[PDB]
Ligand binder design. Sequence first.
Ligand SMILES: [Zn+2]
Length: 328
Amino acid sequence: VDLGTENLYFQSNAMYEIKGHHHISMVTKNANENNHFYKNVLGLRRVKMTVNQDDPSMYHLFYGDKTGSPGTELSFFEIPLVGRTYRGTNAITRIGLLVPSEDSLHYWKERFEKFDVKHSEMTTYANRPALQFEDAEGLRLVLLVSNGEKVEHWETWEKSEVPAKHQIQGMGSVELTVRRLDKMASTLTEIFGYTEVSRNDQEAIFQSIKGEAFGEIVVKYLDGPTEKPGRGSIHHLAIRVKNDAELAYWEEQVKQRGFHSSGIIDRFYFKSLYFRESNGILFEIATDGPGFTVDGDVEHLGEKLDLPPFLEDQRAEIEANLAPIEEK
Ligand SMILES: [Zn+2]
């Protein structure tokens, strides 16, 4: 007799849930200006000042909440001689950031006026009240009303320029612009078990957890030239998994669908793997832990140049080749 779960309906073969976005990584031409914008204007904490583990000559700066928790992290590689981004398709194109209330949108509109930040009027984005804005490098962002919803582990930053009740909470919708929306949709729903909120030929919206903003992806169809990335480009989007066992599971799933995995790499603050999908979008799958407090106290995160253990042998060399980040 069939006594178990033989006949039950599931939407995907996915064995595990994906809680949300982990972090998103970008290219900046100028760390001083980047630091001023993300820390001083946007009020985020600089949770880690380090170097590209694959190239110790390049700054890698993370911003986020009090501890840089998964879901809150925006990171930037500083590449001083990089050129402009030429916009186009097959690229991650917009970062959604949750704020608690429509009131927070009004707070932000005034702040953007004050700091001469490029910004929209009050609008709607993926069915949420929103305010679009850009940094000086052409990176596109959008503030999105959360109604106070948050990933449990997120914490506001007590030394921010921004009042707690209006602070950026962490990531919401992330926008992908692609030639083949069907192929991207299949990846998200058939492999990863994302819930399709809506879909037409022009745009589709997916949620890692049904009803939650924290893992939401907006997929837009755009024909025409592919983006030529430079300053202000988004390099990859990372999604969250609970532990190394889930990471290994996903590595297997990715391989079965014919994508080519980087293999699991220990990034110290987490383990991850990277893969590109059909449209060339680079995704990373990252464990939640151990996080940025693994190698330091919360009190002093981001204040000095932190290095993964394997690079301390080269600290003298690394430090000598880096200009200090100047607070303006
Ligand atoms: Zn990453």
